[PDB]
DNA sequence: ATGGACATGTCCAT
DNA sequence: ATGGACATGTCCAT
DNA sequence: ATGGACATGTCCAT
DNA sequence: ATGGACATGTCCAT
């Protein structure tokens, strides 16, 4: 279907706002995120967090949906998929029951489920909100990307953005944001010749 | 206990004197291939085509034919067979339009009568023509083989150097003569090689 | 009253039966112009008085022209208004000892009542002329047109090619029919000409 | 309008020698010299080397002046500008700050002045002189040639030469260096010019 | 005024 | 870049 | 073709 | 996990 995701920004009434711990002067981590671009930097299949914040509290069936799309629309409809090569590939693949297929995967929760509508294409990662346990804290969410942006026949170096919603107990969204990223082995390196090149 | 399919590297000049020379090459860095004799290393880019003289002092017994296979030059890599990277493979580029199985790595552009073998006792693939006399030009007998995977590939070759191997044969199979080489599936051989020419001629 | 932004393409004979009849072409090989019916496109060499006989089934409105206006062939260019190319426009050649303006392309060689129009709502550079009845023994009415640029030319046509509208015309505009045709502002039409029924006859 | 310019090739104080980059077998590069027919062939608006020597140093104000003249005697006086259409064109200008009718552009230092003398019209591109990289290569510069010598209603394909007139501060010449050129669509085909010179 | 040869430029694959 | 087919206009003789 | 810049990733000593 | 050299392919202009 030449159907295209959903990607402005949703508030959500809950001010529902996504956002990063922050780096305290960091090099070349597993990952990093920059405001100053509003795009993040996660090193291939390493672990990353994602800070979630609120503003009342959601009803119950409350999930988020982790997806992704490439950001320029000549492969806006084209979907997002783990390269040939990945998605084949005996590492991070064997053992390991999430889909092959996929690119967000969701290391931690272990309830965390996979979608591939049929109605679409578009696969992607869900879990139920758990509110933060201890009090007026932040709700985080482990991811790992299956396959660099680098990946041929995959994304294509094609620069891809994510997709993070807020939803309903059924599918329904109150909220939800967005960022670019890319999968580089050295975030980093990358953010700081992204910066630099450009003001 | 007889017949051994894993490889054989070691080269056998045979009966006939088998011989695998080159032609010269664009030492351009961007050319199509390129030869480095003294390193002994063959230069050659994706799918581009890449000649190899091919020559015998007396002729070869009635039925002979010529087979190139790809083997891991090293040996922790022996074992592992070389089968274009499944990205290609499953590529649906450079496949359509072809009779060569894209399951392979070495192709040949020219000949009609090109067998691709894909040994079922040992899962070796390769591609086998029939001996083709050098009809009127010099001693020189000429195969066209293609190269469907950058030695640098993923999932495939993975950077692993691979060395070829040309064996001269019987219908029987049996083996008359063989000599082999170092390649490089890349792009700017040029490069590379003078490259790879330096660290040697460096140290 | 002449309301379409982009000039009018499609054939309109309109009630008094429009028809704009070709002249027998100087079959030639280098002549002046040539007109192949077969391409339903003419060739004028570059300013050489060119002809064009005019039929109608009746007598047309008082007060009734004829317009000439130059519109390129495909979309792809169409926007763009037939200018000539600013060389011969800013010319000292063919410029002076004209009633005509050096930017307009087509002339009216020969009526002492011509008329070069430039709509200023589109940029429509043109060329009318009051209609006058055929006369002695013949019902063609034929005017003498004049092509200032060969297709060649670069500030103007690049190489791109054109369709002439012959439109007819009320004195306020409403037009009363239409006829068209590619035009290719040569030297060697009949050479130009057969080429171009040669490079399709085929296929 | 008036008188010519000066002609002759002038070595100079300063054995001011002009030459191009010698050549490995090349059939249609962006340009090219011919040696035996002392003219070069710059492909039209592209960019093109003229190699520099000299043998004491220059002065300070030492400045190099490139310009173009008509060798075809009759038509000598006139001005080399550029062709109409293309001076005036979709063509380029905003690119180039440089004058828009003025032929010899210089593609490179952003100091170059082209002027357009008031008494004889005249339109030459100037800049001073830029010992060697300071390494041997003895000061290349580069020159953009933005019309034909095909383009019309210009040069209006008249064979013309370029004399360098390397100078002084106040505007005395030391060494001038000249020798014909022709922007081709294609130089790799004026190498049959040079054919039909031994056609015989 | 006429047709053919040449002159110079554009488009194109590797 | 690097030749090779063709687009197009001009010169030269008839 | 063609070479030069450069995009993105692997290998390392700490 | 940090800074650095290099491996490799692609892009751009030529
Ligand atoms: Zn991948
Ligand atoms: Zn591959
Ligand atoms: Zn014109
Ligand atoms: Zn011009």
Redesign the pocket.
Known sequence: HEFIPSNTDYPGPHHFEVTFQQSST?????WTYSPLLKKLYCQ?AKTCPIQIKVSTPPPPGTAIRAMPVYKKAEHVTDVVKRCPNHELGRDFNEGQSAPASHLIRVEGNNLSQYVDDPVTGRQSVVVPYEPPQVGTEFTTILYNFMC???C?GGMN?RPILIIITLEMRDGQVLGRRSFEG?????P???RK?DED?YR
Do not use: E, M
């Open positions: 960091a090099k070349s981590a597993t291939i660099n942006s680098s041929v170096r890319r999968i580089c082995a050295c980093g390196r990358d010749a090149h």
